[model samples]
Target: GGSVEDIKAKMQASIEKGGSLPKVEAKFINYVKNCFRMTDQEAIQDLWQWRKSL
Candidate 1:
C-alpha cells in the first residue's frame, strides 16, 4: 500500500507539519528497507539522497 510516491507524499506532509528533516530521512530509510524490502545498502545509500528536501 506504499509506493515511493505515496511515501514521498506522506513525508512532505509530515515535514510540512514541522517534522525534522534528518529524522524523517532516517525513518524513510528504515521504512523503505523494512517495509518495502529493499537492501540495507540500497535503502540507506540511495534513498538518503532523494530523501532530502528537493
Candidate 2:
C-alpha cells in the first residue's frame, strides 16, 4: 500500500539498521506480503537472492 519511494526509503532504513537480522528479515517478508504482490515462487527466488548477497 506504499508508494515506490516509501518502499525504497524503508529499505534504506533497514540497511542502516544492520545488526538485527531477524528484524530485517521480518520487515522484508512483510514487504513482500503487503507491497510486492509477488507470487510464491517469485518471493522465494527473491529471498534466495537476498540471502546469497549476505
Candidate 3:
C-alpha cells in the first residue's frame, strides 16, 4: 500500500519520462482507486477533475 503522495510522485516521474498522458491517466486512476479505496464514480470524477487541473 502506498500513500497518495507516493502515487503522485510515481505519476510525475512517469510523465517526466515521456509516458503518454492517456495511458498514464488510465493507469494512475486505476492505481489510486485501488490503493486509496475510492469508489469507481469517485475515482473517475476526481481523476478527471485532477486532469483538468494539470
Winning model by TM-score: 1
Q: 1-54, model 1: which lDDT tens digit per residue?
A: 765567556656776897644548667666766755655585466667776635
lDDT of 2 by residue, 1-54 (tens): 664445445655776886322336555566555555533666545653554464
Candidate 3, 1-54: lDDT as tens digits: 655456556666787898544437666566657755654676566665666676
Give stretches of model 2 more than 4 Å off. Answer: 19-35, 38-54
Greater-TM-score candidate between 1 and 2: 1
lDDT of 1 at 6: 70
Question: Would you list the rank order by lDDT, best first?
Answer: 1, 3, 2
lDDT (CA) per prediction: 0.63, 0.53, 0.61
- Positional deviation of residue 41's Cα in model 1 after best superposition, in angstroms: 6.0
Clash pairs of candidate 1?
A: none
The list of candidate 1 runs beyond 4 A from truth reads 23-28, 31-46
TM-score of 3: 0.47
